[PDB]
Design a protein around this ligand. Structure first.
Ligand SMILES: *[C@@H]1O[C@H](CO)[C@@H](O[C@@H]2O[C@H](CO)[C@@H](O)[C@H](O)[C@H]2NC(C)=O)[C@H](O)[C@H]1NC(C)=O
Ligand SMILES: *[C@@H]1O[C@H](CO)[C@@H](O[C@@H]2O[C@H](CO)[C@@H](O)[C@H](O)[C@H]2NC(C)=O)[C@H](O)[C@H]1NC(C)=O
Ligand SMILES: *[C@@H]1O[C@H](CO)[C@@H](O)[C@H](O)[C@H]1NC(C)=O
Ligand SMILES: *[C@@H]1O[C@H](CO)[C@@H](O)[C@H](O)[C@H]1NC(C)=O
Lengths: 196, 67, 114, 196
């Protein structure tokens, strides 16, 4: 019995969830089926995917809407090959570890004092469920300088080279107060300060 | 230095692997019984430093009817 | 938030402390909490936490467990007199090792925080 | 006239009393223990002593705890309560000064300096902030700009320094929690030189 591809699910900002799988490496082209339910709760009924995703004219994923998302009850997906029913796979996922928030937005800088800067931003998400990573660099820097930030979502730079141009960017993660996701959001739109 | 046979716990049994000092043993609730939550089945051979005799620690284990 | 956030911190401290220890006790563990029975499940976690304290023989464990319980109970008292029904007894739960127990403990606390 | 106490977030409560044998008594609302320290003169008009609740890094109190603090002074054959306070520990935090200051790397115009914090409760997580200041050759400590770190960042990279120059560096720490919470004392100054 040829092994089915692994299903990877991510909950994007708790607005929807894409559950995808690599459609390639399959000898015969097939539309794989996906069913799902949640353990315990009142959602333990087998659901058919109501929104299949397609890559190269075959099923490559499934999308669930917000109302079908339950972070704190185990999510169960069943992938199956309709042409060979024996090929069936079940995965049990913890969605609170699989939340990926949207990138932070509205980055702003303001002068706290001489040669001191404060970076602020917004997230389209409940604040305390997020941690952050701030990165900055000058045009001379080989790589980014970074510093972790918690749910306060502020950042101060106490020593600034006034002769150099800085770039700031921030990303966010659903960790560790409401879940323990390892993956980070994409980087925010960057902003600049000063000039060379 | 060895410990004497442990005192019995109601509706439980114990099969000691070692009676020697510092040994950790565990009571097992009988069939049709469960360890009460919040109570421990652990006992160990410690030393009464005042009297130089070894005794098993008194377990907090309460074996209740299987719900 | 608040108290539960501190509860998370204490849970993480317990996880750290027990690493260098040999606590092979099995503990009643609700890994799949029903929202209608979340308070009942929480109280079972709090009860079983005492077993870890007793079996540890460690002062830092004693303090932290005692601290956690104080913090947790303070939040559960603020949750009102909401009674839950048709919930399992703690002894009806699956038994698991300290690792899985603590992991599921974190899981339910995160649920309360959110 | 004044009875002021601070909790170090672990197992010490430092008390000062202003106004002949006196002491501070600690009576917690939900712990089995009680604590006492003999008030000693630190000036002509002030007395002080530390309530030791346990080992240096033990967690002896939480935000739920309320400790009744009393100043007791012997007056003949009789003791009297001179001051009383229902101490909410996490509303009156003052940490130990940052320790273990060291230069990570020094250049001609730049210097990265790191430090650690002492006896800070794990309850804080990353909910902390720091302030630093640099002593310059022709100036004094009071003239030194307060550098602000609004996140738990245990290092600072001083920019725009002068080559072949002696500097001194201090840092202090404060939790974000607590109405009466104040800054830690300044750390011991760290002396360093920029490269020629
Ligand atoms: C979740 O899956 C959906 C559906 O595949 C993705 O939406 C697609 O995004 C790109 C944008 O060019 C295109 O393939 C389609 O226009 C979109 N399909 C739609 C809207 O049905 C979406 O990008 C995925 N989300 C994330 C963050 O990966
Ligand atoms: C200054 O030195 C500090 C201490 O080494 C650096 O902070 C470390 O950075 C690395 C890489 O991000 C982290 O993995 C460590 O956890 C950090 N240590 C501490 C104590 O936070 C810092 O990157 C240096 N600053 C610059 C500008 O080079
Ligand atoms: C997969 O499903 C699509 C949509 O129903 C269909 O058009 C396509 O022919 C299918 N491919 C197969 C059966 O290999
Ligand atoms: C970003 O800023 C705009 C106003 O310029 C605002 O409308 C929007 O809500 C902000 N985004 C967030 C996440 O707050």
């Amino acid at each position: 019995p040829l092994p089915l591809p692994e299903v990877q699910c991510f909950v994007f900002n708790v607005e929807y969830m894409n559950c995808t799988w690599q459609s390639s490496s399959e000898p015969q082209p097939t539309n794989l089926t996906l069913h799902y339910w949640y353990k315990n709760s009142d959602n333990d009924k087998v659901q058919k995917c109501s929104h299949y995703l397609f890559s190269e004219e075959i099923t490559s994923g499934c999308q669930l809407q917000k109302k079908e998302i339950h972070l704190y009850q185990t999510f169960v997906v069943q992938l199956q090959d309709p042409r060979e029913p024996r090929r069936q796979a079940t995965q049990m996922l913890k969605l609170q570890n699989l939340v990926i928030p949207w990138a932070p937005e509205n980055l702003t800088l303001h002068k706290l004092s001489e040669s001191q800067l404060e970076l602020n931003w917004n997230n389209r998400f409940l604040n305390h469920c997020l941690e952050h990573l701030v990165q900055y660099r000058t045009d001379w820097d080989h790589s980014w300088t970074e510093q972790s930030v918690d749910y306060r979502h502020k950042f101060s730079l106490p020593s600034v080279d006034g002769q150099k141009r800085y770039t700031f960017r921030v990303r966010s993660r659903f960790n560790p107060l409401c879940g323990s996701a390892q993956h980070w959001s994409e980087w925010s739109h960057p902003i600049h300060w000063g000039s060379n | 230095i060895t410990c004497p046979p442990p005192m019995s716990v109601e509706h439980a049994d114990i099969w000691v692997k070692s009676y020697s000092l510092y040994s950790r043993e565990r009571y097992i609730c009988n069939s049709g019984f469960k360890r009460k939550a919040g109570t421990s089945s652990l006992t160990e051979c410690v030393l009464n430093k005042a009297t130089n005799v070894a005794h098993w620690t008194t377990p907090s284990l309460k074996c209740i009817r299987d719900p | 938030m608040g108290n539960w956030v501190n509860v998370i911190s204490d849970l993480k401290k317990i996880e750290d402390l027990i690493q260098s220890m040999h606590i092979d006790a099995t503990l009643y563990t609700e890994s799949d909490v029903h929202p209608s029975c979340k308070v009942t499940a929480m109280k079972c976690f709090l009860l079983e936490l005492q077993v870890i304290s007793l079996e540890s023989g460690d002062a830092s464990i004693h303090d932290t467990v005692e601290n956690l319980i104080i913090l947790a109970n303070n939040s559960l008292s603020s949750n009102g007199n909401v009674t839950e029904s048709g919930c399992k007894e703690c002894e009806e739960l699956e038994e698991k090792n300290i690792k899985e127990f603590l992991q599921s403990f974190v899981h339910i606390v995160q649920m309360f925080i959110n | 006239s004044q009875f002021t106490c601070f909790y170090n977030s672990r197992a010490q409560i430092s008390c000062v009393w202003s106004q002949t044998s006196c002491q501070v008594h600690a009576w917690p609302d939900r712990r089995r223990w009680q604590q006492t320290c003999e008030l000693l003169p630190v000036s002509q008009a002030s007395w002080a002593c530390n309530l030791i609740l346990g080992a240096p890094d033990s967690q002896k109190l939480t935000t739920v705890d309320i400790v009744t603090l009393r100043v007791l002074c012997r007056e003949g054959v009789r003791w009297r309560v001179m001051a009383i306070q229902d101490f909410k520990p996490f509303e009156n935090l003052r940490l130990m000064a940052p320790i273990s200051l060291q230069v990570v790397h020094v250049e001609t115009h730049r210097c990265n300096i790191s430090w650690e914090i002492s006896q800070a409760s794990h309850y804080f997580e990353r909910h902390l902030e720091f302030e630093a200041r640099t002593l310059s050759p022709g100036h004094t400590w009071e003239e030194a700009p307060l550098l602000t770190l609004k996140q738990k960042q245990e290092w600072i990279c001083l920019e725009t320094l002068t080559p072949d120059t002696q500097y001194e560096f201090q840092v202090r720490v404060k939790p974000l929690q607590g109405e009466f919470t104040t800054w830690s004392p300044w750390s011991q100054p760290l002396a360093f030189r920029t490269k020629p």
